[PDB]
Amino acid sequence: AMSESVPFLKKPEALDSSMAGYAGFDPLGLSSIADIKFLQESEIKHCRIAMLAAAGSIAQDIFTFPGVSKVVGTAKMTGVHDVLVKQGAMGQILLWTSFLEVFGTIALLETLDGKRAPGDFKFDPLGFSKNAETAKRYQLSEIKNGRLAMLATGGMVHGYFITGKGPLELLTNF
Amino acid sequence: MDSNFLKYLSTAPVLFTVWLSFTASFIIEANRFFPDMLYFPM
Amino acid sequence: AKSKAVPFLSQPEALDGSMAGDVGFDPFGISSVIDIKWLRESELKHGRICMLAATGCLVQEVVHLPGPAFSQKMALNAWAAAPRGGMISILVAIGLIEMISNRFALTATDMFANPNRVPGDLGFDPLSLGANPANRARFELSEVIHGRAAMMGFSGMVHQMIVSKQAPIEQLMHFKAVDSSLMKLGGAAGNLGY
Amino acid sequence: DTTGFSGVPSQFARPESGVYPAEPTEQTFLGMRGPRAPGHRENFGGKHTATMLAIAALLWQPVSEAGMYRMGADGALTKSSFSNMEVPGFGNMKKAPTIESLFPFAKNGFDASPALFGKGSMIVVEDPRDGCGAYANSGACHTFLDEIGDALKK
Amino acid sequence: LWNEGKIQGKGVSVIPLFPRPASLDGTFPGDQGFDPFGFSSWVNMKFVAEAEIKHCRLAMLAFAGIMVESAGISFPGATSVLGSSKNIFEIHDKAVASGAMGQILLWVSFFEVVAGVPAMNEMLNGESSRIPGYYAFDPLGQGKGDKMGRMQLSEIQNGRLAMLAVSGIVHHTLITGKGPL
Amino acid sequence: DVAGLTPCGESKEFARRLDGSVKKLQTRLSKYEAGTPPALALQKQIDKTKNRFDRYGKAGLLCGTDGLPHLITDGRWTHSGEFVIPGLLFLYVAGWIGWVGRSYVLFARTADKPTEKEIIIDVPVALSFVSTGFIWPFSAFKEFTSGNLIVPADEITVSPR
């Protein structure tokens, strides 16, 4: 048993193909250190938050909701955060996500108990995961897109620090 | 080190002299670095 | 039956290669007079304190809590500038941690009374990172080595702050060699005092 | 014999309890491994501690932002302390203890926030390197590596 | 190939002035006695073998880089931002000042942190049976018996020669003040 | 202030004590040349004398008519650093020494020859005991309530009357 993603390394002995997004990639042996269900839930959480963050960067560059331009002007990305901490916007977001995270704490503790799949909040209002094969295709897809957006978000915010522009106008200029 | 010489250094006059020489020495050092402590400073 | 660390000396008894970091290094034979369980408790305790302390010096140089009372880049100045009430709060909290974590078995005569008690093992694993028994041996080894390295490193940092009145990495980046006129070592009795 | 610092109370003629509880293995997130009562880790285990810490961190957000927020002529909000509210029925005590007495951030000048650090009293992050390199520097910046090079060429 | 008995293999001493020690084992690639100070008696043979192959590969790549940067050959725009000189030391110093050397340092360090240290730990513990220096990096074919017989020997010798030659070049350039080619 | 005494920082007789003590040293310094070892020594003494008087002046001590600092020991908290706090430090050390010596005497009773342990001390066991003394108040009080500090009156030898 050698890793399919890193061939000169051994299989990481806590990862199995029944997981979503499995490529045998754990060279530092972290899946042996922490509990794997915690790591999976942390990965999906990071994935979804970063997908929202990347889309928000793109959309914020394209358009902005009515009235927002007056309160926050030339500021963009991290720059708006400080202005919107002065107003009540950021605090209200923190409050409602924190409310959701209390139940997510209870959900994660049930996951570590072994009664819930990681990332399973059973949220499927529109019907997409009716069929099993499509559920698997979506599960692999959502981890893949979330990973891509994790690196994306990283790149976008660091480009903002370097240039002061942000993702779309950084494409337009330079 | 020889166990009989260590048993000699464990005798009462040797330990008494060493312990109170050590005691005398850190009182002397404490009064060298911190002299004239008439009161607990507070 | 010779020591591996010190090849010309004999292997000290109570050192049998079972403990992590056991390389046979006991030339003064402290383990023959003091029980090895107490010594490993003291080694792990010293090392953990130092690991935090070394990280404390480096991070305190870089990152600060807000306020003028916490703006001391040089760590030896932080001791005096940081609020006394909170520093003595730290000391009292440490004392309560010492009595509870040891379960009122603190004295040399009473600690390890329970045969279940293990040197350095206080039951501290909040996130169960030592749950896997495959990782147990190298974790024990790397904890012992990190502790030893950090004891030596913190000793160096404190006495280099004494010699050079600079925080440690700022000392590395604005380095100045010893004049030798200052910081004379000894000399209290050579000049007969004064 | 007694080796010294052995720790067994029977080798030092000390009275022991004679009761040495069996050591379990289960752990709690903000607690320790040790002898508990039966059923203790099922009600006050990791589930309890994580949920209670989560609720305390959620309820910190109103508490850290506590104050009397009132509107002026426009929608502009003014913040006031809860001391300014006067209770009407308790004799000579006119102002009354509130949540600002258990969490007095303002007196110590803390500017508490839901994240725990506000604009005022933000964490301070500086750069030790001081805008220069490891080696081959010029000016008011002379590293340890530069002194190694300086000594080797002299 | 292996050429056991003639070169490499076992019982071959390239400097008969030093007898071939019995500590040394005749089963490591490019191994031909040559152990004067008796290091193989006590060192881990796999660790020093991996270290020798890795030092060989840096030496070869460094030789290739020294020759190219001493022939004046460059990538487009490299000489615009870096210097136009061909002194290897000055190019290192200005590529440090440009951040290019920091980027190479970053990615080489990342490769060691996530792949070099696990490959070392597994190869020395005895959990993976990876031969020293192997990273399954054979994209352009050239595998089979020749790779484990003659090519293995070629890598070890060409690298030892590259080590000697690069040490030679850097010392000669420093004393003369002038580079090669 | 307390008991008609004067704080040492404003008593004029404390000031005359300091001035006379420094003139006594300066007239001895007037017989030596500048860089000599007796001159350096006397200047170090003058600095030490001035430091001591300055420190006593700012410490809250109360000088008498004589100008010498007096100690107030009635229990008031403004003067606790003169008897109450040094006394707490003493009782901790003294109780430590007593607890540690008692623990060694009880260990030595259970030995092969109990009187050989007291003229030839078992230094590892005795150092084990000297380390235990830091929590002597709790150890000694628990010893008391568990009926192990005090022995009953009928296991103690007494005179016939």
Ligand code: CLA
């Ligand atoms: C990590 C996620 C993240 C974070 C921290 C922020 C933070 C912020 N955004 Mg951005 N934004 C995000 C995602 C994010 N956004 C997404 C996903 C979009 C849409 C593609 C946008 C589009 C957007 C615009 C257009 C604007 C902001 C603005 C702002 C600022 C004020 C908040 C506001 O009114 O936003 C409004 C944002 C929204 C209403 C979109 C919220 C998206 C939610 C998360 C979708 C969730 C639905 C999903 C099905 C889950 C259902 C819940 C269920 C589980 C119960 C603040 C800087 C404003 C600003 O200051 O710009 C200068 C502004 O004009 N955001």
Ligand code: CLA
């Ligand atoms: C009985 C509970 C109690 C109470 C009422 C106080 C009250 C006080 N403490 Mg605290 N303190 C306590 C326990 C307590 N302390 C304990 C147990 C410790 C030891 C760990 C400390 C250590 C401590 C320090 C070091 C300082 C105080 C300070 C203060 C004063 C100002 C607080 C302030 O402005 O908060 C508002 C500010 C905050 C909420 C900022 C919080 C900063 C973060 C959370 C620090 C990170 C903690 C860190 C991870 C610790 C881990 C170790 C721990 C687990 C053992 C206030 C008189 C400060 C002081 O005296 O200033 C005048 C000060 O410098 N305290």
Ligand code: CLA
């Ligand atoms: C003459 C040089 C030489 C030789 C004989 C080998 C031989 C080998 N290597 Mg090594 N290797 C080398 C250089 C070399 N390597 C260098 C410099 C690097 C760093 C980039 C590597 C990195 C490397 C890895 C990471 C791994 C190997 C492995 C292997 C083995 C299998 C691969 C194979 O057979 O393809 C070898 C094919 C060739 C040598 C064809 C020739 C290509 C030439 C050398 C390129 C020349 C570049 C350029 C033109 C420079 C000249 C101009 C300059 C002066 C300006 C084999 C033992 C694998 C192994 O089994 O390890 C034990 C493995 O996993 N090698």
Ligand code: CLA
């Ligand atoms: C550590 C042993 C020890 C202990 C716990 C006590 C305890 C006591 N003694 Mg005894 N005593 C001791 C040693 C000890 N003594 C020795 C060595 C001598 C000979 C000098 C005496 C002579 C003595 C007299 C004459 C009197 C007491 C009295 C008392 C009582 C009141 C406290 C006091 O007056 O202290 C007084 C202490 C001394 C006069 C001498 C103490 C000398 C040193 C400081 C202590 C011994 C240190 C010992 C070597 C410890 C080694 C420990 C090591 C092996 C680990 C108390 C019962 C008094 C009493 O009966 O009151 C009711 C009293 O009148 N003691």
Ligand SMILES: CCCCCCCCCCCCCCCCCC(=O)OC[C@H](CO[C@@H]1O[C@H](CO)[C@H](O)[C@H](O)[C@H]1O)OC(=O)CCCCCCCCCCCCCCCCC
């Ligand atoms: C999921 C987590 C991912 C994390 C990924 C990041 C971490 C990955 C691991 C990283 C491990 C460390 C790698 C380096 C990181 C920082 C890179 C960096 O830019 O560094 C920063 C510094 C340089 O800093 C430079 O400063 C210049 C201005 O002066 C530039 O303008 C830039 O600021 C910067 O490039 O790097 C060093 O100082 C390196 C010193 C040398 C280190 C070894 C060099 C290679 C070995 C050969 C040396 C032989 C010496 C022999 C004896 C000589 C005696 C004199």
Ligand SMILES: CCCCCCCCCCCCCCCC(=O)OC[C@H](COP(=O)(O)OC[C@@H](O)CO)OC(=O)CCCCCCCCCCCCCCC
């Ligand atoms: C495991 C931890 C290891 C710790 C290692 C210690 C590192 C630092 C040690 C000193 C470094 C170099 C010293 C040169 C400095 C030096 O030698 O100065 C010399 C000084 C005496 O002064 P002189 O007579 O040399 O004056 C000379 C003239 O040139 C100047 O007037 O020697 C001492 O006595 C000082 C040390 C105190 C002696 C007592 C120490 C306390 C005793 C405690 C019990 C014993 C502990 C061990 C005692 C040795």
Ligand code: KC2
């Ligand atoms: C409604 C009342 C109540 C509240 C609001 C509350 C809040 C929190 C918070 C909130 C920030 C944390 C972080 C927390 C954590 C722990 N609680 Mg909990 N707790 C409450 C009730 C009880 C009882 C009755 C017990 C208990 C225990 C523990 C143990 C130790 C277990 C061990 O170490 O084995 C830990 C770590 C047991 C105990 O031993 O306490 C000494 C025990 O019997 N708790 N608790």
Ligand SMILES: CC1=C(C#C/C(C)=C/C=C/C(C)=C/C=C/C=C(C)/C=C/C=C(\C)C#CC2=C(C)C[C@@H](O)CC2(C)C)C(C)(C)C[C@H](O)C1
């Ligand atoms: C027990 C023992 C061990 C040990 C150990 C050791 C050495 C432990 C040391 C532990 C330490 C250093 C703990 C530090 C805690 C700091 C706190 C809580 C800061 C609070 C800041 C506050 C409240 C504020 C404020 C504010 C003020 C007032 C006003 C503003 O202008 C500024 C500001 C906004 C910031 C170990 C574990 C190693 C092993 C073994 O088991 C034995």
Ligand SMILES: CC1=C(C#C/C(C)=C/C=C/C(C)=C/C=C/C=C(C)/C=C/C=C(\C)C#CC2=C(C)C[C@@H](O)CC2(C)C)C(C)(C)C[C@H](O)C1
């Ligand atoms: C175990 C446990 C967990 C945990 C945890 C924690 C808190 C782990 C943290 C561990 C840490 C902080 C380790 C730090 C080690 C420091 C070292 C080795 C420094 C050595 C310095 C040297 C050699 C030097 C030097 C220097 C000198 C003298 C000269 C200077 O001029 C310069 C220089 C700087 C070079 C958690 C809580 C997560 C839960 C889990 O369930 C169980």
